[PDB]
Every structure is written in C-alpha cells, then in structure tokens.
C-alpha cells in the first residue's frame, strides 16, 4: 500500500543521476589539528 501511494504521489522529483559519493569525492573533508578557545571568565562553568 505504501509503495502504491508513493509511486502515485512522488512523480515530480528531480531526475539528476548524481550520487552523493561523487559530491563527497569532489569536495573531500579532511582533519586539521587546531583549537579555538573562547575565554569568558563571567561564565560559571567551563565546557570543552
């Protein structure tokens, strides 16, 4: 029943044949050792 409803209702979607894997391979993510310290002595608690 769900499959019939879906194939009847979802008929206007884009048809672009681009996987997410290609986008990830085209803009890869990498890790950089680094730190950001937001120093505020007025906050009662420290969170890191």
């Amino acid at each position: 029943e769900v499959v019939e409803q879906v194939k009847k209702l979802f008929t206007k979607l884009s048809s672009d044949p681009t996987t997410t894997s290609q986008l990830v391979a085209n803009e890869p993510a990498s890790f950089t050792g680094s730190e950001v310290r937001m120093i505020d002595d007025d906050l009662p608690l420290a969170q890191f």
């Binding site: 050792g33 680094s34 730190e35 950001v36 310290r37 937001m38 120093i39 002595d41």
Partner: protein, 68 residues
C-alpha cells in the same frame, strides 16, 4: 586571577613550516633594525672609537716629540 575575555585560534605545530620565516620580510627586518637603533648604536660606538683614536694620536705625537 585577572578576568579575561578573548578568542584564541591556534594551528598545530605539525601543520606549519618551521624555519622559512627566518628569511621572510628580510628587507623590512633590516630596515626596522637600522632605523630604530641607529641612534643607540651611534651613542655606543662614537665615544669608544673617538677615545681610542684620540689616544693613538696622542701616543704618536708624544713619540715623535721625544725623538731627535
């Protein structure tokens, strides 16, 4: 303890070049050193060199005037 507010961003030592900065901006480094320090340098070199040269001149004149 002083109450401080600041944001500090830092990069890891293993992600940056360690020695090339020695030789970057080298004309600026030389220019700053000369322009900020030439008075101090003069005030240090001038009395010593002047006193030395005057002493040498005094010794040469005294040596000559005792000859025959």
């Amino acid at each position: 303890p002083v109450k401080l507010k600041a944001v500090v961003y830092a990069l890891s030592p293993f992600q940056q070049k360690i020695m090339t900065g020695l030789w970057k901006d080298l004309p600026e480094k030389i220019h700053h050193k000369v322009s900020e320090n030439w008075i101090s340098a003069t005030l240090l070199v001038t009395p010593v060199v002047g006193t030395y040269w005057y002493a040498q001149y005094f010794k040469e004149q005294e040596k000559l005037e005792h000859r025959f």
